[PDB]
Nucleic acid binder design. Structure first.
Ligand SMILES: [Mg+2]
Ligand SMILES: [Mg+2]
Ligand SMILES: [Mg+2]
Ligand SMILES: [Mg+2]
Ligand SMILES: [Mg+2]
Ligand SMILES: [Mg+2]
Ligand SMILES: [Mg+2]
Ligand SMILES: [Mg+2]
Ligand SMILES: [Mg+2]
Ligand SMILES: [Mg+2]
Ligand SMILES: [Mg+2]
Ligand SMILES: [Mg+2]
Ligand SMILES: [Mg+2]
Ligand SMILES: [Mg+2]
Ligand SMILES: [Mg+2]
Ligand SMILES: [Mg+2]
Ligand SMILES: [Mg+2]
Ligand SMILES: [Mg+2]
Lengths: 106, 49, 49
RNA sequence: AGGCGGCCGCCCCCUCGCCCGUCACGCACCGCACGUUCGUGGGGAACCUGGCGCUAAACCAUUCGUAGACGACCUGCUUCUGGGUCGGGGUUUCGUACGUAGCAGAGCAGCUCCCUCGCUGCGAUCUAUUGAAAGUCAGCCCUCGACACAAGGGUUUGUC
RNA sequence: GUACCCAUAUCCGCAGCAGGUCUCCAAGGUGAACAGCCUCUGGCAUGUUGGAACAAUGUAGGUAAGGGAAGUCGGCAAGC
């Protein structure tokens, strides 16, 4: 019942293990969609083209080991779905990854 | 898990005696057993009841 | 762990052992050190110190 | 592989709980079968009533990996010592990151204070920062640091 | 006569069939090379299906301490 926005550091290197080379970067995005559905609760997940570039920036098998993401939850209108809420996952770049944790962004 | 033990062997009549022998040794954690029940048995001519 | 249902000496049981060294090396890979104080005394200060 | 039997004291009565003798009746259904029995026989679905009680558990879903072809098996879930995601260390794996500085560097080129290892530029490497950087559980260990979540669902199951 | 395909989808093979069918044009780098590999112009959605897990067996590929043909009809295959 909220419109909140948080940040995460998803660990794609441990959410992908033992997975083949030609089907690695798609499983990254399937796992990002499942992580967004698990955290924010709604089944509708829309990920952006910047996050698409950030995942597919190093080929299909050299998936980057960790990606800082920002999950906003917004409402849907104009003859909406049965799921009125949808998580718009956007990509926020950061130089380092250490000592960074989950932040509720106003 | 498993560890080594460097063990002195006091077993006479061998090459093993008076030397240190390393043996593969397991460790089994055993917390104490809390007693709850008592079950009695009757010797039947078909077995135990 | 069940008690043995038969009794044997066989020079295999009832030997007063003398444990001398039980290694606790790094089993998550190849173990190089025994205790944390010994590892820190061998290596020394790092960036974390 | 047990449930009827025996003893003491009371309870409402029986002194016909039985054998022989007298009397009169009950359907005498007029020739006819499956009649008499342990039967208040076995179990299932319901009908109205008295008394005494009971207030759950499986399966799916999710997670789990000590198991998995699929099924199956071992597991967690609470609003407080709960789990999950990040982060932090512990371990380990490789081998010393980018950047910066150097009167280190085979040498080469240029300049003028005419520079008494003068200065500048190119230049594989090397040294110091550096037992550095990077990964570390997805099937490693501890976290009571930060976020959120927690009874939120569907199907089924009774013994006179 | 003048369109179009000229082909792992417009031809033949019963078919949108790993088969067959005659030609011209040809870039940059490494390289002796129109070799093999990576890019440019120009095309494409992986070749009549997608999703989940990574059991046996299989089909292709790679290793393996010590011995080096002792296996096998034969060094077959693989490797130097
Ligand atoms: Mg590097
Ligand atoms: Mg034409
Ligand atoms: Mg063809
Ligand atoms: Mg044919
Ligand atoms: Mg052909
Ligand atoms: Mg060329
Ligand atoms: Mg050339
Ligand atoms: Mg030519
Ligand atoms: Mg085709
Ligand atoms: Mg095919
Ligand atoms: Mg397809
Ligand atoms: Mg070999
Ligand atoms: Mg060998
Ligand atoms: Mg030889
Ligand atoms: Mg020979
Ligand atoms: Mg022969
Ligand atoms: Mg051959
Ligand atoms: Mg070889």
């Amino acid at each position: 019942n909220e419109v909140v926005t948080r940040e995460y550091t998803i660990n794609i290197h441990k959410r992908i293990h033992g997975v083949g080379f030609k089907k690695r970067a798609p499983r990254a995005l399937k796992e990002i969609r499942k992580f967004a559905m698990k955290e924010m609760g709604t089944p509708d997940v829309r990920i952006d083209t910047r996050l698409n570039k950030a995942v597919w920036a190093k080929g299909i098998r050299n998936v980057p080991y960790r990606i800082r993401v920002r999950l906003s939850r917004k409402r849907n209108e104009d003859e909406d779905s049965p799921n009125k809420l949808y998580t718009l996952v956007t990509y926020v770049p950061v130089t380092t990854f250490k000592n960074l944790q989950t932040v509720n962004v106003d | 898990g498993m560890t080594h033990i460097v063990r002195e062997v006091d077993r006479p009549g061998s090459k093993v005696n008076k030397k240190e022998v390393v043996e593969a040794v397991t460790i089994v954690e055993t917390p104490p057993m809390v007693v709850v029940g008592i079950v009695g048995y009757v010797e039947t001519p078909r077995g135990l009841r | 762990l069940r008690k043995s249902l038969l009794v044997q000496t066989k020079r295999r049981a009832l030997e007063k052992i003398d444990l001398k060294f039980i290694d606790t090396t790094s089993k998550f890979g190849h173990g190089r050190f025994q205790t944390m104080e010994e590892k820190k005394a061998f290596m020394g200060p790092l960036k974390k110190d």
